[PDB]
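FAQ: What does a ligand-bound record look like?

Like this one, built around riboflavin:
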Amino acid sequence: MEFLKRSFAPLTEKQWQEIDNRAREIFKTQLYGRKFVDVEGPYGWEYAAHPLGEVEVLSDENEVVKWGLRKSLPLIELRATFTLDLWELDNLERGKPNVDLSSLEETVRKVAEFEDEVIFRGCEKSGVKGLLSFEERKIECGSTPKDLLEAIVRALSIFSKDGIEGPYTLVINTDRWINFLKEEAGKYPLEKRVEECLRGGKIITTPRIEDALVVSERGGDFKLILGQDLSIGYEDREKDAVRLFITETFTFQVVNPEALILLKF
Amino acid sequence: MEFLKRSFAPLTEKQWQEIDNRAREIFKTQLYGRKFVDVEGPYGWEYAAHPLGEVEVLSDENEVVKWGLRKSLPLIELRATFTLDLWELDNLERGKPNVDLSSLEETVRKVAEFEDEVIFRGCEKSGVKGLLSFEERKIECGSTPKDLLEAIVRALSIFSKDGIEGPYTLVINTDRWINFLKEEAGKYPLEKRVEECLRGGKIITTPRIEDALVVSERGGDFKLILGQDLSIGYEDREKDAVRLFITETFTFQVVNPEALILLKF
Amino acid sequence: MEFLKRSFAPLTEKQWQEIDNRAREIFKTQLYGRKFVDVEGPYGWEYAAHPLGEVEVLSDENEVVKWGLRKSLPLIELRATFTLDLWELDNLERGKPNVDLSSLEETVRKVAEFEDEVIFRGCEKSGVKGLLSFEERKIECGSTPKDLLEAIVRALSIFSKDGIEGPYTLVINTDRWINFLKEEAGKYPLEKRVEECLRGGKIITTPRIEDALVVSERGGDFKLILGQDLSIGYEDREKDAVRLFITETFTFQVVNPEALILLKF
Ligand SMILES: Cc1cc2nc3c(=O)[nH]c(=O)nc-3n(C[C@H](O)[C@H](O)[C@H](O)CO)c2cc1C
Ligand SMILES: Cc1cc2nc3c(=O)[nH]c(=O)nc-3n(C[C@H](O)[C@H](O)[C@H](O)CO)c2cc1C
Ligand SMILES: Cc1cc2nc3c(=O)[nH]c(=O)nc-3n(C[C@H](O)[C@H](O)[C@H](O)CO)c2cc1C
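The answer part, i.e. the structure of the complex:
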């Protein structure tokens, strides 16, 4: 990847490795969307659009030759920059085990948050529709631990009436889960009951939403399309610091809206 | 090519061959643009857009993460229909050499004219710019046969001052050429003089323009991009007739505007 | 060639190739002197002077030991600089076919003009004498197309009286050639007559002179001596631009002044 001009920066191999290994760890645990969707393999740094499969007509009614245009989806590209310090970085060659790298982490968190916002709520100027926008898949619930177990059993019937099968998964907030655990105290464990009602499912707690939703994981309903994965590169040299950046290119879409249910409580 | 539903029409092999061979001949001689441009090979019935290689910025000035969208060109698709007669078509099996096929020819001519209009004058709603739009490549001429020979020699100097080489070609109207031939009568032939001033070039007469232009043919300056070539297919059956159609998908662009000169007289 | 510090510039192989290929084309057609002289092979970046073969005496008349110094010609070295833009250059990796490179071309033209001026008119401070300085090889002509054909036939006799043979070539201005072509209109072609009078020669039109001259091309009368050919290198990096330069080292001389005739009209 020669468009990332790495070999013109005054660093060594050990310093490059130390920089990469720290960002990999945080990206592993802070990307919540990539836990239950599909990913389509990289195409390259020159890919530009993804086809939809239709045509719109722009000619009159009485003409002999008739014509129109094809339709597609554009990709999104991002870039974010930060700085580091050379004397502090150079203590690694004298044998120091712990070095200060706070700016890197602070930037990584914001990039992850930006990426999740599009999957959960969509983008207006690009023509993307998110999960929380389908308002014909909502059902009502209550505020006691009993209504949750009622609602799961009600949802599985609607799933069966449409032909959808496979393992099922629950995605829920964190404070509500803690409140439920506090309210149910001194009795049979609640995780066991929930997994038995799901018939061998899973629970995922996140701070990105405000209520709960239920999905199926047979495969082929939510797609994320990548051109280039997340990468780090070099920009310029200041008086006694260096400047680096992070980049990526992507888009997202939803195919079958019948494998998703929203709970309101 | 199974999207052209040919095998559901009540015809035989000889009738299909007779229909194809007549259209090929007229398409060979009525497509004037394809004589001096480049053609990029077919990509398929699902190709949708062609990339340009840029990005436009849509974020604010003070933000930490910045983003934009990629850019491309959409393709154009066309379709035209006509009808034929079964009893008249069926005399071919009794041994008749000449059959009436006038509607086919009348439709082929209009399709060819539509295709040439875009190359010579562009399309507003698709973002295409044509040859006659570059107004900084014009020079002046006169109305006598002497000024043409002066203008060619003047143009070759401007060609040499930019680094452009290769064989050269002249494209001119028809009535003006006939008038020049009438005005020069009883002297040395004019084609020989013109080709000697071009230093071994060629002359092309067409009814599509109104003046003359000079181009170079080294290769790599005018591109035509095809998805699917021109094809014939079947639609439905009327009381005692049949209905067929013609289709294609394409786009066009100009790379180096320095291999083109326009003459005004 | 390691004195051209190329590998310290933030560019890639494709960008270097794109920069070289454009300058080669313009240098090919804008160097007019190198069409009918001889070139002596490169000697290196350390060559400094070329010997003439004489000695001048600096001692008195009555002395017992007598001495002097040898004589030679010094070489000329040049350098010219320009700047380019990084974001615009970086669109080549996204797939763009046409990039802006105007400063390079504007500098190349001036370097070519500087080089031709020395061959055609000489240098005072270096001790070089040019072609248009030999005033004992001039003959007179007129302003009609007939006098040119008379003058060529007169010149070949003077050539034969000295022992000079070989193919012959005519070098002439451009506006005068166009005026001659306009004045001779409607008759036998003029290029054929001129080449027949030259007995199988060639014609070269240039904007560098004001009249015509006739030369012979048997070999060994006009020499151009090179130390290093034309080259491109890297200087420094500005805020968001880069700085590059062009260099060369040469000299020139005339051996036999009897293979050259000047026409005045
Ligand atoms: C013993 C010593 C070691 C130093 N080591 C480094 C170093 O590894 N990196 C660095 O950037 N500056 C270092 N400096 C400081 C450097 O000489 C200077 O302060 C700045 O590089 C420019 O003023 C060092 C200074 C001293 C006295
Ligand atoms: C001797 C004869 C031959 C015919 N051949 C054809 C034929 O080849 N194709 C056809 O469409 N109709 C043909 N017809 C006409 C057909 O029977 C009828 O007019 C229409 O097909 C429906 O009314 C023929 C009629 C006759 C009397
Ligand atoms: C999406 C995006 C892509 C960019 N690409 C480049 C680039 O390829 N080269 C460049 O010099 N600057 C680029 N810049 C601008 C760069 O971040 C910044 O403007 C200057 O490099 C220093 O301010 C880009 C900016 C954005 C937002």
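Follow-up question: can I read anything off the structure? Yes, for example: The CA atoms of residues 51 and 72 of chain B lie 4 Å apart.
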